Write a protein that binds this ligand. Structure first.
Ligand SMILES: *[C@@H]1O[C@H](CO)[C@@H](O)[C@H](O)[C@H]1NC(C)=O
Ligand SMILES: *[C@@H]1O[C@H](CO)[C@@H](O)[C@H](O)[C@H]1NC(C)=O
Ligand SMILES: *[C@@H]1O[C@H](CO)[C@@H](O)[C@H](O)[C@H]1NC(C)=O
Ligand SMILES: *[C@@H]1O[C@H](CO)[C@@H](O)[C@H](O)[C@H]1NC(C)=O
Ligand SMILES: *[C@@H]1O[C@H](CO)[C@@H](O)[C@H](O)[C@H]1NC(C)=O
Lengths: 418, 417
């Protein structure tokens, strides 16, 4: 169905807090973090890590991976009902979970670590991946159907030393699952020409900077490269993953990414964790090998820090930024919808926006002006005739005894008045 | 089989039950006026969310919810909400009661624009309504998932007003029975003062039983507990019929609960007056309602100055707390529920398993000085093990969000270990 395509300052966006169920807790002094949200085919996947104390550095208490239905509550407004919850024995070992819906199940692929975040301790992390398959509609007195845990032995990684899921959600093509992922490649093996680093209109940029900034720091062992992890269900036996590296068009440090189907075709978002701060988003040209037709988008960036702030395009050695994805809602006019932090060098001020490449059509703040915020994950879908979007937004520093993200439901307007 | 010996061993091991609800939108919030029903592998739940104080705060959201009680995987019960209803105005819905029948929970509530009808009886113009929620919603149906019915036809006998007054009721065939209360004018109230048992009570007057049948001694109406009957076999008119409880061991109308256990119906009525010992027993007849109260002598409830725990002398008092119990063995008449172990303050919740004249085994749920009010227990079989779920109102040390805690307790077979 149609949507509003005119640039207007009218209050036609009316964000509401969505009703969603989870295992209800009464523990104080807790931070809910490392969120994941996937919405596909009338079902959803959700995850978090509960920490006691600090969000960044508290003692890990509970990890949950959960799935359920996204339903019409009665008055043509979406709700969410959890149906199946999985919990590991040790909360601190599960990292970088990514989820993909196929049939009956949400197949979630996580990394396993005893050295913390593999990104921050790459050389130490011995590569271990595993898959939690949860059924979106549990059946009593079945076997493996409801919950099944699989340790991945067979991993096909090309020329990369290590590979890992790196993103919230992926897609299905037939019976082949594609998770967003990243490859770890030694700097010395990294094939790259310094002449291709666009420093030509940048007085204080060096040719070396693009290459140097392909790692988490300038003297890091590995470089990171985004990609897909492929999992073909048609071979119904031993589980075998194949890594696919992203094309080098507009290349940037491997960063959390998302692949999703919208209006029949696949679309890619990659976070801008470096100097190329403008939003990276576009239709998938080919999936294997992965190649994106990045939009020449000129109005959506992300907050940085001193070295690589918002709207930066000059190559610099920096690892900073925040994942703030967007969802294509109209391909003919290429309009998307997502939440961006309206701030240059601090993670603040979340704003839900609907935008073309060179224009924000209409928007609305979700919190105040001085409200702290990090990750934002948006997924959009039809509920009968009407396009709806669900957005999980990390909101911190609030003073709550329990810091947890807030989930918004937004109706996209058809008319441009009112 | 269950353990039938009086034991001090730690054979009860309460655990926090996993249950899902819509996450709250904020803090500085109190979750109150709870309801919990468990029946036929499904559950019904309700609360009112207030901003600020529990008794004084700003009403923000009312939810009525239903869902499945499932085996999570390791033979331990879990709860999954499936269907949630919310009124436009949170402050108008009062005294909800729930009963399950064929795919639906039917909850029955008071509609008031004057607050709690109990505290504003003369002002409350009698309005009742029914929210029917499906325990397993189906997409692209009509009324099936949620249906709201305003009750017009009410048959109340000689009572001026009637109202649901309790968390849950039972089904018999296609006839639903909610716990309820009738409002009767004092002047119309037929009662002989000679039947007031003051004979072993130096400082009790004959008038006191009658006077204490109202919320205060000069109140317009008296309250009398009972059932509201709703027969589904007739279409065309949602008529409710009120049934007054029998006058055996009569006491001020107070929140009550009717439930089936081991094939037969059982009644609990709260002790909101001077007769402070637990009121509980098998239903003799349902219409008219008559209970075979147990001569139970070990379970009471905290009161206040005038009518404390273990009081049996007639006094003019409206005080007490709803703390029900669930029969788990009729042959030996053993029940299970949570009581507040305190004489004159609402404190110290203890899960107990007891005969009429004996507490067999028990365990504290919180500390000794932990504040607590209402407790609702429902028990059921899982694989072949008896389980009990207990919703307990608790107010902890400084807490940002005050909400009740739901416990799951396995009843032991052996008396050792
Ligand atoms: C990184 O790995 C080492 C093992 O060489 C481990 O001892 C150390 O604690 C890890 N650091 C972090 C950030 O946990
Ligand atoms: C998946 O496996 C089947 C059977 O080996 C093969 O025919 C098919 O082409 C594979 N699909 C992809 C896209 O890898
Ligand atoms: C962006 O612009 C470049 C050069 O003008 C072009 O090659 C590319 O296809 C454009 N992308 C889209 C999707 O318009
Ligand atoms: C952010 O940076 C841009 C360009 O560098 C500038 O136009 C804008 O005023 C800055 N915003 C604020 C409010 O600091
Ligand atoms: C309910 O109504 C039906 C239809 O008249 C009747 O057969 C049945 O006995 C009634 N049930 C009760 C318990 O009142």
């Amino acid at each position: 169905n149609q949507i509003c395509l005119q640039k207007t300052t009218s209050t036609i966006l009316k964000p509401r807090l969505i009703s969603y169920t989870l295992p209800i807790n009464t523990r104080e002094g807790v931070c809910i973090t490392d969120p994941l949200l996937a919405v596909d085919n009338g079902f959803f996947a959700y995850s978090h890590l509960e920490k006691i104390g600090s969000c960044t550095r508290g003692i890990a208490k509970q990890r949950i991976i959960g799935v359920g239905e996204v339903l019409d509550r009665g008055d043509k407004v979406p709700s969410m009902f959890m149906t199946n919850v999985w919990t590991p024995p040790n909360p601190s070992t599960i990292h970088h979970c990514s989820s993909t819906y196929h049939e009956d199940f949400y197949y979630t692929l996580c990394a396993v670590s005893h050295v913390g975040d593999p990104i921050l301790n790459s050389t130490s992390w011995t590569e271990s991946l595993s898959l939690i398959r949860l059924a979106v509609r549990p059946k009593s007195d079945s076997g493996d159907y409801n919950q099944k845990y699989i340790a991945i032995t067979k991993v096909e990684r090309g020329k990369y030393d290590k590979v890992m899921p790196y993103g919230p959600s992926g897609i299905k093509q037939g019976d082949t699952l594609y998770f967003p992922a990243v490859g770890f490649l030694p700097r010395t093996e990294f094939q790259y020409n310094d002449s291709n680093c666009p420093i030509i209109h940048c007085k204080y940029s060096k040719a070396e900077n693009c290459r140097l900034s392909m790692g988490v720091n300038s003297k890091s062992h590995y470089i990171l490269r985004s990609g897909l992890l492929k999992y073909n269900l048609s071979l119904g036996g031993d589980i075998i993953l194949q890594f696919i590296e992203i094309a080098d068009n507009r290349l940037t440090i491997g960063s959390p990414s998302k692949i999703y189907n919208s209006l029949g075709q696949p679309v890619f978002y990659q976070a801008s964790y470096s100097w190329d701060t403008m939003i990276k988003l576009g239709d998938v040209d080919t999936v294997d090998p992965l190649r994106v037709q990045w939009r020449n988008n000129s109005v959506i960036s992300r907050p940085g820090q001193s070295q690589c702030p918002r709207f930066n395009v000059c190559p610099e050695v920096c690892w900073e930024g925040t994942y703030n994805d967007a969802f294509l809602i109209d391909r003919l006019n290429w309009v998307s919808a997502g939440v961006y932090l309206n701030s240059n060098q601090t993670a603040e001020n979340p704003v839900f926006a609907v935008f073309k490449d060179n224009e924000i059509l209409y928007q609305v703040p979700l919190a105040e002006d001085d409200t702290n915020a990090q990750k934002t994950i948006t997924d959009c879908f039809l509920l009968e005739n009407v396009i709806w979007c669900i957005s999980l937004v990390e909101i911190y520093d609030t003073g709550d005894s329990v810091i947890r993200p807030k989930l918004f439901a937004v109706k996209i307007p058809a008319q441009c008045s009112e």
